[PDB]
Amino acid sequence: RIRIRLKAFDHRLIDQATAEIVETAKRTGAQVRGPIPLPTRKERFTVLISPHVNKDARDQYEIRTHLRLVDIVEPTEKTVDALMRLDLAAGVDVQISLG
Amino acid sequence: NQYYGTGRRKSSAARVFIKPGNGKIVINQRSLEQYFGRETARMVVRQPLELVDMVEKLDLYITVKGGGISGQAGAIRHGITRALMEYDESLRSELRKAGFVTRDARQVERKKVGLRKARRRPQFSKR
Amino acid sequence: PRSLKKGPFIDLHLLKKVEKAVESGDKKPLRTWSRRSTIFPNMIGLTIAVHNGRQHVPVFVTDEMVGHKLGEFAPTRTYRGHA
Amino acid sequence: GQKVHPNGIRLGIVKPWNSTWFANTKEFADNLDSDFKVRQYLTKELAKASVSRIVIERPAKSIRVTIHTARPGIVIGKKGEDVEKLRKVVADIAGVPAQINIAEVRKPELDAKLVADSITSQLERRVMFRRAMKRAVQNAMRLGAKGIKVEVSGRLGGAEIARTEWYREGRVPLHTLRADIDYNTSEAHTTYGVIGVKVWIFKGEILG
Amino acid sequence: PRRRVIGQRKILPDPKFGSELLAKFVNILMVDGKKSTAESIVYSALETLAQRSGKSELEAFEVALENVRPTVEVKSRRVGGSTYQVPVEVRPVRRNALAMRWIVEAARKRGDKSMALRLANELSDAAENKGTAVKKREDVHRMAEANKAFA
Amino acid sequence: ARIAGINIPDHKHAVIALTSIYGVGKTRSKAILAAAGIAEDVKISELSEGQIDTLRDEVAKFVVEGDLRREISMSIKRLMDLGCYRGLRHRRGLPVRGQRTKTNARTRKGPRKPIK
Amino acid sequence: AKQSMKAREVKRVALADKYFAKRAELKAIISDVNASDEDRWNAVLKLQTLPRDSSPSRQRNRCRQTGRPHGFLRKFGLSRIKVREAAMRGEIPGLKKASW
RNA sequence: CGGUCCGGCCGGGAACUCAAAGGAGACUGCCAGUGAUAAACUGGAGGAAGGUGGGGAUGACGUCAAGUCAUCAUGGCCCUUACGACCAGGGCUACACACGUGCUACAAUGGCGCAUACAAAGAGAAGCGACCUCGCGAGAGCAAGCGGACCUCAUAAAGUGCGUCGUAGUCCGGAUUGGAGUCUGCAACUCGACUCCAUGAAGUCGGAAUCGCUAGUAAUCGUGGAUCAGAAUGCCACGGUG
Ligand SMILES: [Mg+2]
Ligand SMILES: [Mg+2]
Ligand SMILES: [Mg+2]
Ligand SMILES: [Mg+2]
Ligand SMILES: [Mg+2]
Ligand SMILES: [Mg+2]
Ligand SMILES: [Mg+2]
Ligand SMILES: [Mg+2]
Ligand SMILES: [Mg+2]
Ligand SMILES: [Mg+2]
Ligand SMILES: [Mg+2]
Ligand SMILES: [Mg+2]
Ligand SMILES: [Mg+2]
Ligand SMILES: [Mg+2]
Ligand SMILES: [Mg+2]
Ligand SMILES: [Mg+2]
Ligand SMILES: [Mg+2]
Ligand SMILES: [Mg+2]
Ligand SMILES: [Mg+2]
Ligand SMILES: [Mg+2]
């Protein structure tokens, strides 16, 4: 089996990649587990927006790091190598865990 | 034959399962007197089953997570009302009047910038 | 304070100057910017002019001045009073 | 000290980021330095080219710089001459293999950075600021903008008292979140000081 | 406020007796959000109160509350060059709130050790119609009829 | 009720009335009563005089009122005689441990000294 | 910031990466309880003999664009100002104004 | 359900909680009355939510020649063998005093001791650092697991149950100071934090004066993060009771 972890910032582009790899391993391999969604990391930030002196004047930003977990139960040979050779857009970081 | 309801509160989440029986209350594999060391929470978890007269009528299996003592008691009441309306549905006309079916949406307010709390401003001085 | 397992602390150039004045047997005042060096028992009887930021104040070394550092005997802020 | 940046406020709704990559905290600020140095280099080299938006994207440890420009003929030159000159220095800066694509800017009168740099270049060659603001508005409303606002600031005509001026034609709703407000800002370094130029362009509301 | 008279929020009754008023008393007694302690103090004081009186705990609470409920308070108006203390009839909600507030303040000010001893002694004195809480009720009525010309 | 020179109140418990001794605290008083085998909930009343003699021997194990005050005065006058920074702070009446003297040095400096 | 302060930060990074293995060798000796005390004393005198700029605690994380010693953020390598300018122009991926 | 070392633990199951992604939902939409048949308002009906449901972001033309040439940029002026650059030490922490903002208190709605219950939200590779051992202790050693819904920080405290003190400058309060130490770091004298033993100031609710807050609010209780080798009672966030 292959655990696949997708880390991204845009959830539409990660759901685009997860459904892409599902239809891929659905055609080639067998028993795609599911696009199980994980909790989203929210790395917040808070900065002073004034150059010199305003302690109360601030912006509060964040970065939402969207996680997706997709498992492949029976890896064929073309399932593994042809899906590893298949690549997705940037912003998505894929991370395979074979077994 | 068990009848289910989810109750929620500040940050609590109760899972109530109703079976007909004698009135045995089990919360997280514990008795109500063991679990809530508080008579106000012992009242609010018995309030709808004394609104109707069904304390002795039915047994119940309860799990609850998150929150505190009054939070878990509020979600247990809201789960019990959700499940008694699943049991009968003729009781919604009374539990609405009792204010029980309404989920209390009073979350805590976030701390804001400049303010030491949600609304407390720091101490002011002209000079 | 420092851990005992690290022992005391002293500059190497100070410990060499102490070793020199010991072997030479000279009682010249050793001027030193090492305000952070712990005094050793072999330093007893020496005039060491500790820096203070502005000049070098001479410190005669006593028995009781062993377990301290040289900076304790060189005050850096001069204060006499306001009135 | 009042107004939010309309791009940064529209970045989740109708505007895209100019850098779309992912990294962990170890290689984040290093990628972001490499992006800063390449936007710096490309702006200095293509200063005469009317470049608007340098989009950076890096898949699989390979940088891809998409330059949006009004004319690609001066950016390319001969077929793979100047693009390749800029590509080998991009790969020198980023330390990874590079790839340069060029997206043409249709209607350069409807792009805030191009209008602001045309005004800045005009002020640098000493034209009247009101004439430059007039021609930017008339050209944009002719080319089809639903609303333009321009604004200059400071040391106008060599006057010692710095003041601000602004023109507006059409509706420019900044508080409307789904409004496609193209906003950008240039600076003219005259002999009397620094003249700041801001330009808002409202094309219309995205109905997502 | 300027615009509206408000709609008050609903209070729970107490678990022991079902009384709304006793839970309003434990909220007035409660400091720092510690309701559990003030509920224990009230249930201990009404325990010794019915021990000292043989009545219901609810009945002797209402008796001590009755002998401290004010009927007319005063308020500053100052329409002339100085302050006029004008009387006014007190509605039964504020009558009950001022009573329980005055009882709590006296039980804070007594010199007994336990809070339940200050509150049971103050309620038993209020039922005997003496103590500082009824003396505050008297001094309020006395300034009322000493200012009854203003209306 | 008379240990190490001074008297000791009888109505208090054992650890507290021991802590009346200048040189012991609640810790060392527990170490004393543990070495004497005496329970802590008892008073100085209803103690055997053999128990009080064991207590006197256990207190005599440590350094106390006159010895301890002599040692403290010796350490301070050692810093006084050296003329270190801690000695100068001890004889200027200023705080030793590196606290602020611009504000809030009132424990070492006493009450306020008005500008005359 | 100044040019010389930037030059000091670069010099303190080059020396902190140069002597990094030797300082950990000496600190392994000094921190080792199972060692000769004359060896630990010679090691701590060698560590005095090394330059002061070899320590990682000596150098300060300045802003990578301006050298600003205050307001630094480790994830972006920038101060809070150039963070706000980059987040507003959208040069920082996935970074936007939050509200909750 | 079947099975157990009684631990979802283990076969399993997918309902439930939850995790996200998408969608529905509330619109004066309906009923009645008022109104100038208008706008609209009041009420109740249902409904999880009712009139802006709650909170946030969002700050018009301009004002104060407000603030910042020390984030940066920049016109002009000045220095250029010094107003530039390098190093050590010192200082920015001083101290007759005055003010602001905070923390801890003056206790019995409490200090104590023992036992025990319930959180959310975060951070982690030059990092978080179990378990076990040693130390009263801060910590040390060996050392798994973890780029992390898995592992770690990390046992929430207030609370509850029993006993205790019994109105005292106290078993309140913890300042100050002495001694012994740990850790970080080339290095803790000036000038770090923390621990242990001892020490046990003032203070018994605060003059004139003055501040915040309208509901999950104030009040109170703990938790986490940024910065950071180390160094917060500040700041920014989180939930508990209420
Ligand atoms: Mg402030
Ligand atoms: Mg004031
Ligand atoms: Mg604003
Ligand atoms: Mg003592
Ligand atoms: Mg510069
Ligand atoms: Mg530093
Ligand atoms: Mg409705
Ligand atoms: Mg000015
Ligand atoms: Mg100024
Ligand atoms: Mg200046
Ligand atoms: Mg220096
Ligand atoms: Mg300062
Ligand atoms: Mg104490
Ligand atoms: Mg307790
Ligand atoms: Mg007790
Ligand atoms: Mg006194
Ligand atoms: Mg007292
Ligand atoms: Mg730190
Ligand atoms: Mg940190
Ligand atoms: Mg809170």
Side-chain angles (χ1 to χ4, degrees):
Chain A
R1 79 279 189 192
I2 298 171
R3 300 287 192 69
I4 302 167
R5 291 175 65 89
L6 282 79
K7 292 170 72 177
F9 289 158
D10 50 1
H11 73 278
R12 289 187 298 273
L13 189 142
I14 195 166
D15 285 329
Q16 181 179 0
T18 194
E20 195 275 333
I21 290 300
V22 171
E23 169 150 325
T24 301
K26 187 180 291 294
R27 291 184 291 112
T28 62
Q31 188 78 358
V32 304
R33 182 70 266 170
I36 294 168
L38 295 176
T40 302
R41 182 178 180 179
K42 295 178 182 83
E43 318 94 3
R44 290 218 176 89
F45 295 96
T46 303
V47 293
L48 297 176
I49 63 176
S50 176
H52 192 273
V53 55
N54 285 114
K55 188 66 172 290
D56 292 331
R58 300 192 192 187
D59 283 345
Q60 287 178 353
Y61 302 107
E62 75 183 3
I63 288 169
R64 293 186 179 180
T65 302
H66 293 284
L67 261 291
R68 291 296 180 273
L69 187 78
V70 173
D71 195 2
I72 303 300
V73 181
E74 291 88 3
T76 67
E77 284 62 0
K78 60 181 214 297
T79 303
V80 53
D81 308 279
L83 277 59
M84 185 176 309
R85 89 177 184 71
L86 193 171
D87 287 349
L88 283 293
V92 174
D93 188 18
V94 292
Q95 183 100 2
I96 48 156
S97 296
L98 181 158
Chain B
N1 200 2
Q2 64 272 17
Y3 290 160
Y4 174 72
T6 299
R8 284 189 289 268
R9 196 59 179 85
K10 290 185 179 182
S11 64
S12 84
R15 298 175 69 249
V16 178
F17 294 96
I18 298 297
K19 295 177 177 153
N22 67 315
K24 294 185 288 294
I25 299 97
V26 174
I27 298 170
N28 298 315
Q29 290 88 339
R30 290 178 180 89
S31 178
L32 178 60
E33 299 291 328
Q34 296 175 225
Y35 189 75
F36 292 111
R38 181 76 176 123
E39 294 293 328
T40 304
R42 296 177 183 178
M43 181 180 72
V44 297
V45 302
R46 293 175 180 174
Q47 198 180 355
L49 281 193
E50 204 265 354
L51 181 64
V52 299
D53 291 332
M54 292 179 121
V55 57
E56 73 291 326
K57 187 65 69 177
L58 312 88
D59 296 329
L60 303 84
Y61 181 74
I62 295 173
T63 299
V64 62
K65 293 181 180 180
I69 299 299
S70 65
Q72 289 177 355
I76 286 168
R77 186 183 69 187
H78 190 263
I80 291 169
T81 57
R82 186 68 66 85
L84 263 66
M85 294 187 290
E86 183 67 29
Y87 175 73
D88 195 4
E89 188 64 28
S90 56
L91 304 177
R92 189 184 294 273
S93 62
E94 291 177 350
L95 273 63
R96 173 72 68 187
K97 186 179 289 294
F100 290 166
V101 298
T102 293
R103 189 259 193 271
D104 187 299
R106 294 181 292 170
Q107 302 297 109
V108 61
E109 187 176 3
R110 44 171 309 264
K111 183 182 182 295
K112 300 174 187 175
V113 56
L115 281 71
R116 291 180 66 192
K117 283 172 68 177
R119 290 186 182 183
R120 177 173 175 83
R121 193 179 297 275
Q123 190 181 6
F124 178 71
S125 177
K126 289 183 180 180
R127 273 83 65 192
Chain C
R2 201 181 188 186
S3 296
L4 294 173
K5 66 182 183 181
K6 289 186 184 294
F9 186 77
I10 186 167
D11 280 316
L12 79 170
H13 56 82
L14 180 60
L15 187 60
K16 296 296 289 182
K17 284 182 179 176
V18 172
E19 284 170 29
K20 278 181 264 170
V22 166
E23 293 179 353
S24 176
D26 52 352
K27 53 177 178 331
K28 185 179 184 294
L30 280 76
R31 61 140 176 188
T32 303
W33 289 272
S34 183
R35 300 187 75 252
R36 65 183 184 177
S37 296
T38 304
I39 301 170
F40 282 87
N42 57 6
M43 302 172 71
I44 296 172
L46 300 177
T47 60
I48 313 178
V50 183
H51 198 246
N52 60 5
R54 184 171 55 186
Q55 60 180 354
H56 289 101
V57 51
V59 176
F60 185 106
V61 181
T62 318
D63 191 296
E64 295 292 328
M65 293 184 183
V66 171
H68 300 300
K69 289 186 177 182
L70 286 177
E72 298 185 358
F73 300 96
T76 62
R77 278 88 66 92
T78 167
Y79 172 69
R80 296 180 183 91
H82 294 287
Chain D
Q2 295 171 356
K3 297 179 179 66
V4 74
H5 194 278
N7 191 3
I9 188 66
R10 266 69 169 188
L11 287 177
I13 299 98
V14 295
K15 294 293 183 182
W17 289 267
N18 293 323
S19 296
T20 290
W21 47 264
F22 180 79
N24 287 317
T25 176
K26 183 181 287 185
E27 67 294 329
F28 197 88
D30 289 333
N31 290 319
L32 188 59
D33 193 9
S34 67
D35 296 337
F36 172 71
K37 292 175 187 180
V38 294
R39 296 175 195 272
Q40 178 182 2
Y41 177 75
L42 269 62
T43 61
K44 66 177 70 75
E45 295 282 30
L46 296 69
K48 273 74 65 179
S50 47
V51 56
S52 70
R53 188 169 149 246
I54 298 170
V55 180
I56 300 170
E57 181 179 0
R58 52 185 72 188
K61 201 176 69 183
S62 68
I63 190 169
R64 180 184 295 118
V65 175
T66 301
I67 297 167
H68 291 252
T69 180
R71 58 222 182 194
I74 195 166
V75 312
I76 298 168
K78 304 297 185 292
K79 59 207 75 57
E81 179 69 29
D82 297 4
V83 174
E84 185 198 28
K85 187 186 289 184
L86 288 175
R87 189 185 59 81
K88 68 181 293 295
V89 291
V90 170
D92 294 332
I93 292 168
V96 295
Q99 185 179 3
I100 293 176
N101 296 321
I102 296 165
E104 198 275 334
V105 178
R106 297 285 92 192
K107 297 178 182 179
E109 289 85 2
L110 300 181
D111 195 291
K113 183 61 167 65
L114 302 178
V115 174
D117 70 38
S118 67
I119 295 171
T120 291
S121 61
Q122 287 172 263
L123 285 174
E124 269 168 30
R125 62 180 184 272
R126 296 177 182 269
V127 309
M128 296 177 184
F129 64 93
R130 296 177 171 277
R131 184 177 295 118
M133 294 172 73
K134 293 154 179 171
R135 296 181 184 272
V137 171
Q138 292 171 358
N139 289 320
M141 297 302 292
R142 181 186 65 242
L143 264 294
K146 301 281 101 176
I148 181 170
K149 177 169 71 174
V150 303
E151 178 179 1
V152 306
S153 53
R155 288 319 293 280
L156 299 175
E160 61 269 356
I161 302 299
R163 79 274 195 191
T164 291
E165 294 81 349
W166 59 271
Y167 289 20
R168 181 189 295 163
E169 272 81 359
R171 50 189 305 264
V172 187
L174 278 79
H175 282 79
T176 300
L177 269 177
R178 64 187 179 185
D180 196 0
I181 303 294
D182 196 338
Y183 172 76
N184 207 345
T185 84
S186 175
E187 289 182 351
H189 296 283
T190 65
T191 60
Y192 289 102
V194 177
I195 298 170
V197 177
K198 297 180 182 179
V199 174
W200 296 262
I201 292 168
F202 174 68
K203 54 189 80 69
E205 293 182 356
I206 288 96
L207 297 174
Chain E
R2 291 186 183 274
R3 174 62 65 88
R4 65 182 180 92
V5 192
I6 67 168
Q8 176 167 16
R9 60 179 58 85
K10 300 305 165 280
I11 189 169
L12 191 74
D14 56 349
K16 185 70 67 67
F17 301 102
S19 176
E20 300 292 331
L21 178 57
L22 278 277
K24 188 68 175 178
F25 183 71
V26 305
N27 291 324
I28 299 170
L29 188 64
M30 177 186 70
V31 66
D32 296 330
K34 291 184 180 180
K35 190 176 283 187
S36 176
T37 65
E39 182 178 358
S40 298
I41 294 171
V42 298
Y43 290 164
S44 310
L46 273 72
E47 193 67 277
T48 284
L49 197 80
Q51 276 280 75
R52 295 179 184 177
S53 197
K55 290 183 180 180
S56 175
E57 292 86 3
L58 183 63
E59 275 210 30
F61 178 74
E62 193 272 332
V63 175
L65 187 66
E66 183 66 29
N67 291 319
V68 289
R69 282 178 182 108
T71 61
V72 172
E73 65 181 358
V74 293
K75 61 182 287 185
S76 295
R77 186 174 177 87
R78 200 264 307 161
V79 300
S82 294
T83 193
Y84 286 171
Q85 295 297 109
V86 169
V88 60
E89 317 188 29
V90 180
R91 65 187 186 273
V93 180
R94 183 174 171 84
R95 290 173 65 266
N96 213 342
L98 289 168
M100 295 184 287
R101 185 183 300 166
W102 290 344
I103 297 168
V104 170
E105 288 182 4
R108 306 243 174 87
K109 293 179 182 179
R110 293 179 68 93
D112 293 331
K113 292 181 180 180
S114 176
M115 185 64 202
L117 289 175
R118 292 81 65 78
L119 194 144
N121 288 319
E122 186 67 30
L123 289 176
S124 69
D125 292 331
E128 298 270 333
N129 206 345
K130 71 180 183 294
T132 183
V134 306
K135 187 176 179 180
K136 183 68 176 176
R137 192 270 311 274
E138 294 296 324
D139 294 333
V140 173
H141 282 89
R142 183 176 297 115
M143 305 178 285
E145 284 264 12
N147 288 315
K148 193 176 179 181
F150 300 102
Chain F
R2 183 173 173 86
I3 311 299
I6 66 169
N7 291 114
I8 279 177
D10 212 331
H11 65 282
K12 292 182 181 180
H13 284 171
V15 282
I16 296 96
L18 285 171
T19 58
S20 297
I21 299 167
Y22 184 82
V24 306
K26 189 176 179 180
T27 296
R28 200 187 297 202
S29 298
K30 292 184 179 180
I32 293 300
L33 297 175
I38 304 301
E40 302 182 355
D41 299 354
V42 304
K43 294 182 180 63
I44 306 299
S45 297
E46 52 94 26
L47 292 179
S48 283
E49 290 292 328
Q51 294 177 355
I52 302 170
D53 290 329
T54 307
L55 295 200
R56 291 185 181 94
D57 187 7
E58 294 294 329
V59 300
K61 294 180 183 178
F62 301 116
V63 175
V64 288
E65 297 101 333
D67 297 332
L68 184 63
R69 291 182 177 91
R70 194 178 301 114
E71 211 178 354
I72 290 169
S73 58
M74 188 284 320
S75 296
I76 296 170
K77 162 173 288 314
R78 195 267 306 275
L79 298 174
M80 291 293 182
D81 295 331
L82 290 176
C84 66
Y85 182 76
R86 293 177 63 194
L88 294 171
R89 297 286 96 184
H90 271 284
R91 71 192 189 183
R92 291 287 90 196
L94 292 176
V96 181
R97 306 281 181 86
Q99 289 85 311
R100 184 177 300 185
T101 64
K102 190 173 185 176
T103 313
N104 305 341
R106 293 273 80 83
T107 302
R108 295 299 309 277
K109 294 173 68 173
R112 296 178 187 271
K113 281 181 300 322
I115 54 169
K116 55 181 76 183
Chain G
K2 293 180 181 178
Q3 291 301 111
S4 63
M5 296 303 195
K6 293 181 181 180
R8 286 182 224 172
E9 281 308 333
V10 178
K11 187 175 181 179
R12 291 173 182 172
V13 177
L15 293 176
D17 58 75
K18 181 177 177 182
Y19 297 98
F20 175 67
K22 190 175 181 180
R23 292 176 66 88
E25 288 183 2
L26 296 175
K27 295 180 188 181
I29 295 169
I30 299 169
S31 56
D32 193 1
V33 65
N34 292 317
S36 170
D37 293 332
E38 184 66 0
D39 191 331
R40 299 174 69 189
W41 181 252
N42 285 317
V44 69
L45 268 299
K46 184 68 176 176
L47 190 60
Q48 301 180 1
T49 63
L50 297 175
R52 288 184 176 179
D53 295 332
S54 300
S55 180
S57 299
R58 176 164 203 91
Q59 73 214 17
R60 184 174 177 87
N61 292 320
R62 292 181 179 271
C63 183
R64 201 172 294 175
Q65 296 181 0
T66 58
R68 180 180 171 88
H70 289 282
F72 184 79
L73 290 172
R74 287 183 177 180
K75 190 173 179 68
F76 303 105
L78 299 175
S79 286
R80 61 176 176 85
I81 298 168
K82 295 296 183 182
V83 167
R84 184 173 182 264
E85 293 180 357
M88 292 296 104
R89 295 191 299 269
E91 288 150 3
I92 300 169
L95 184 63
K96 66 182 180 181
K97 290 177 68 67
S99 314
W100 64 94

